[PDB]
Symmetry: C3
């Protein structure tokens, strides 16, 4: 997953960013045992008078946008749950500190994606589980792993 979090300048401490990115990472670990390092969160500090909401500068506004690449969400229930859990993780850092905020997700093609130059392994495959356990992208025989994964 690819997350962008646009904040008022200096809204979050380094410890805040660690804690919040950990919470966001836990979504994908807990619900789909994704390798932790798949989860990328980019914090973007926005200076005053750079975020305009409804045509007026808003310096108390956090805008979040994310791509999902590894998995598709194929039912209304699963899609609603993703939004529900995302807001649950964000609330201690954003809602509960009095910020205004908005979030949206896009789904992008799984096959147009490389990490450390490698083809990520198939969902729920042994190699994906290995990548998760090691928490690093391990070079592997893509065809061999795909073949065995298809016969699971």
């Amino acid at each position: 997953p690819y997350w962008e979090i646009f904040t008022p300048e200096n809204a979050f401490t380094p410890d805040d960013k660690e804690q919040l990115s950990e919470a966001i990472t836990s979504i994908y670990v807990d619900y789909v045992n994704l390798p932790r390092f798949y989860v990328v969160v980019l914090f973007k500090d926005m200076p005053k008078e750079t975020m305009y909401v409804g045509g007026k500068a808003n310096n108390n506004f956090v805008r979040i946008r994310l791509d999902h690449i590894a998995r598709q969400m194929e039912t209304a229930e699963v899609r609603a749950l993703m939004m529900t859990v995302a807001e649950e993780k964000l609330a201690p850092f954003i809602k509960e500190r009095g910020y205004d905020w908005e979030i949206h997700i896009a789904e992008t093609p799984m096959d147009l994606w490389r990490t450390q130059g490698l083809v990520p392994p198939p969902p729920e495959s042994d190699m994906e589980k290995l990548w998760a356990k090691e928490n690093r992208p391990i070079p592997y025989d893509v065809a061999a792993s795909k073949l065995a994964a298809a016969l699971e």
Copy 2:
């Protein structure tokens, strides 16, 4: 709508940004009666030698990218009209100030979107009109709103 406008450093004053983001907001207020606060415009100053066009730095280039989330544009005519009006609103600040520029839109799924943690109301619904009038996201019974709006 989620707009990113990448500009040369110090291209726009705060007054500029207010007026341009106001012009952009007016597109959605006027044409589709969207709540103003849905329209988010992020101005991103780009230092010299950070925007490369055709392999060469262009320090006089404004790049615009937007996501449309709330509605889909379903006909060629409506889609063309959006591009035309966007260019109209941008021209006084960008084209007419001598910049080179480029713009594109992506459309993203309506059901993967929350404002203030809330599910936004149906297009053209009473709750959406209420959200526009109050210009804030009002907690409401989503199913009750969807029900009455359908009827």
Copy 3:
């Protein structure tokens, strides 16, 4: 094509950026005959403690994202080729300099895109070839060009 390259601060010099964006541009020129100026690369310096990978800051990490607008890649083989060649162009600047890195592509609708306020010509069309030769967006009659292209 619209590339974003998020890097640690001061990772790349302007000459690095020229060379790398030239390599990226060459992909589209060589394989698709696209006008050079379609290829936009935005370099974004990211301070320490702003890129978090698996819940921990990675201050040695380059993240690349691109939109493809002017072409759709319709077969598995072409799509794999795109990724392979992208990595080949990136390697001297990123992999071989010891960075960790990740890249992905989205495809966005071709009709919601303007450059210099103009409708870009159709893929492989004569007007596209003219735009490529001149390396600038040339105003043209959209209907007149489409009329001749049909014959």
